[PDB]
Structures are given as structure tokens and as C-alpha cells.
Amino acid sequence: MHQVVCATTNPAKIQAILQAFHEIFGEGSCHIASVAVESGVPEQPFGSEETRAGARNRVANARRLLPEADFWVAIEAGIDGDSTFSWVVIENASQRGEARSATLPLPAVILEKVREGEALGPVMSRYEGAIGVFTAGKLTRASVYHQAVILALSPFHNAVYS
Amino acid sequence: IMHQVVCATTNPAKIQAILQAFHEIFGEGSCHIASVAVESGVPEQPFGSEETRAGARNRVANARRLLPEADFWVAIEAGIDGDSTFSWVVIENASQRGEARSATLPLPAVILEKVREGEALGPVMSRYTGIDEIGRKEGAIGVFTAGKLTRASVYHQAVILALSPFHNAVYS
């Protein structure tokens, strides 16, 4: 089996990573474990680049802490000038794979409130993630993370990426 | 009630994704589809978030011009963002606008290299896979995810996310 380390202790993300990894490498061919590391980025990353940078920082930290594993993966959430989304970064001994998730346009009021100091979690909590509430249940956070992990997994099963 | 949805595209994979999203949000057998071919007002191969987004908006506007008595107008435009490919979904109705980006797909350096040299993604992919009109079928998504995902599957979620404003009063 492949030893896959997830730089997150969130069940939704853990679930998506496992599913995505099993779909590409085969059912039951992967063992997943979590490691809690620093993102070197603010709790609520702003902008595509900063959110992705955190994902990368988490992978580097996880990779150094557990050098025995085969894969290191992170999924970092962040907000835009009008939306929320996340970045998936994957690494193994040889290469890296990165992918940004689908975007969720956010209510004007919700946006200005997080732009005033509060984290999205609190503004939504005090008000599955936000995806579930706005897609009337038709989509789950795990469901969009999943597609993202599968995409960033591309380089690892296509020799063309060299 | 019953919605008249105009898709600013003829791409069967896109229409499939649109139709599915609307049924899931508004209910099966509640949306009649009408597809039209229109201009994007942007290059064959758009680059950047801004340019590809502009394409999708122009398509919707153009479509709205031709069939102004419809309820919804939707469009999906693909583009290159950094070392990957993705697309914007733009939706408009009588008084609102909803937009969302689909998940991105990282491309091999050899393909990007060929694309940045001047070739659009579809033709490059056609000589790598031998498949004609890849974008109207499984797409580069289907090829690099080994069928685990398809252009339709990925765009489906993006259309769901873009519909949010239309069924959630909060977006006021």
C-alpha cells in the first residue's frame, strides 16, 4: 500500500483525499494518516496565491516531519474578492501536483463581513461547509474537494508530465 | 414553474452539465433547453481569469439579445490559468447574475509549451491523443484523470455553484 499523509485533521477533507486516492490507485491500496502543521499563512488566506502558498507550506512541513510516507497532501481554503475556494497540493518523492477547487460565489454581506475581520467559519457558523447551505444540499464540501484531489493527482499517473 | 434556459453554446458536454445542474436545483422536468451559437468576443484560446470570464459574459449577453424572452441565459468559457486549464460559468436571469469557476486541471509542461507557442488546447490535445474535438467530448479532463472525471462532471459542479444567487434570497 501507499502511505498517504494528510496535513489536516478535518474529516471532510480526509474523506475526499482517501476516495480520490483510491479511485486512481485502486480500492484499498492506500493508508491515510493526518499530521497537524503550520501554514505560514494567515488563518483566513486572502487571494488565490496566498491560499495556495499555505497548502504548499503545509506539504513541506508534513513532508519533513514524516519523511517515510509516500505522498504528502494538503487542501487549503481561502476567499476571493467575491468567493471562497481551496487549493490542493500533492507531493511524493519525485514530483508535485496542484489544483484549485471549484469556486463558490458569496453573498455581498457575507463577503464584507469577512473583509471586516472575521473568519468565514464564524460568519457562516454564527449564521458540508458553506457549499452545502448554498447548494441547498445538492453539493457537499467533500464532493468538491474530491474532484480537486483527483485533478492534482494527474502528474502521478501520467508519465507525460515527465 | 417551468424555465426557458438558453445555453450560449452548442458544446454537448457543456449543455449536459447545464441541464443537469438546473434539474438538481429547480427540479427534474422543470427546465426546457435551447442552445444557440454566439460570439465570445475573446480569443480562440483565452488566457487569465479576466479574459476567460469576459468571454462567458459576452456569450450570455449575445444570447440574451437573440432570445430576450427567455428566463435564463448561461455560458461556460474555458481558458489557461498559469500551468492549468479551467473555465468560468456565468448565468443571468431577469435581474441577477451568478458566476463560478470550475476546478482547475494542471497540464504537462510539453502541452503548455506547445500551447504558449501559439496553438489552442484542443488541437494540441488532438495530436497527443489522436482525438478530434476533445473539448466537446471527455476533454483534457477525461484524458488526464483516466476517465475518473469528465469535462461534464467537473462543469456540472461549477454550474451548481453559479446558481446559488438564484435560489438563496440572502444574496439579496
Swiss-Prot record, chain A:
Reported pH dependence: Optimum pH is 6.75.
Amino-acid positions noted as binding substrate in the UniProt annotation, renumbered to this chain: 8-13, 68-69
Cofactor: Mg(2+); Mn(2+)
GO molecular function annotations of the record: ITPase activity; magnesium ion binding; nucleotide binding; protein homodimerization activity; ribonucleoside triphosphate phosphatase activity
Keywords per UniProt: Antibiotic resistance, Hydrolase, Magnesium, Manganese, Metal-binding, Nucleotide metabolism, Nucleotide-binding
Pfam families (alphabetical): NTPase_I-T (PF01931)
Annotated binding of Mg(2+), by residue: 38, 68
EC number: 3.6.1.73
GO BP, one annotated term: nucleotide metabolic process
Activity regulation note: Competitively inhibited by ATP, GTP and TTP.
Enzyme class (EC, first level): hydrolase
Catalytic activity: XTP + H2O = XDP + phosphate + H(+); ITP + H2O = IDP + phosphate + H(+)
Top-level lineage group: Bacteria
Cofactor binding mode and count: Binds 1 divalent cation per subunit. Activity is maximal in the presence of Mg(2+), while Mn(2+) decreases the activity by 20%.
Family: Belongs to the YjjX NTPase family.
Role, per record: Phosphatase that hydrolyzes non-canonical purine nucleotides such as XTP and ITP to their respective diphosphate derivatives. Probably excludes non-canonical purines from DNA/RNA precursor pool, thus preventing their incorporation into DNA/RNA and avoiding chromosomal lesions. ITP and XTP are the best substrates, followed by GDP and dITP. Is not active on dATP and dGTP, and exhibits no phosphatase activity toward pyrimidines (CTP, TTP, UTP, dCTP, and dTTP). Also seems to be implicated in the resistance against the thiamine metabolism inhibitors bacimethrin and CF3-HMP.
SUBUNIT field: Homodimer.
HAMAP family, sorted: Non_canon_purine_NTPase_YjjX
The name this protein goes by in its record: Inosine/xanthosine triphosphatase
Organism: Escherichia coli (strain K12)
Chain's gene name: yjjX
